[PDB]
């Protein structure tokens, strides 16, 4: 519909938002009939609805792994935190 271009093909060792939402697809698309065993994998076959995405999900996906990794990272041990925060809208002009 109404939409630009956006996704570059990219293997990013590190996962990412578009990894996260792969990951969580895999055994979505094991189940449609697709030869998906990893995420490597159900990298393609989620190209097109990762496109779909809006980008509040993108980030939303890219902020989720950021800090999951850096919490993984930063100490072997387990590690969840957030701060309640809900703003949308622009505040210029």
């Known amino acids: 519909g109404s939409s630009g271009s956006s996704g570059m093909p990219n293997r990013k060792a590190s996962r990412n938002a578009?990894?996260?939402?792969?990951?969580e697809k895999i055994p979505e698309l094991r189940?449609?009939?697709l030869p998906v065993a990893r995420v490597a994998d159900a990298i393609p076959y989620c190209s097109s609805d990762w496109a779909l995405l809006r980008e509040e999900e993108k980030e939303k996906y890219a902020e989720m792994a950021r800090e999951w990794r850096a919490a993984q990272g930063k100490?072997?041990?387990?590690?969840?935190?957030?701060k309640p925060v809900f703003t949308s809208g622009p505040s210029s002009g």
Do not use: H, L
Not at 75 to 82: A, L, R, T, V, Y
């Open 75 to 82: 100490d072997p041990g387990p590690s969840e935190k957030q």
């Open 31 to 33: 189940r449609r009939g």
């Open 18 to 23: 578009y990894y996260f939402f792969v990951q």
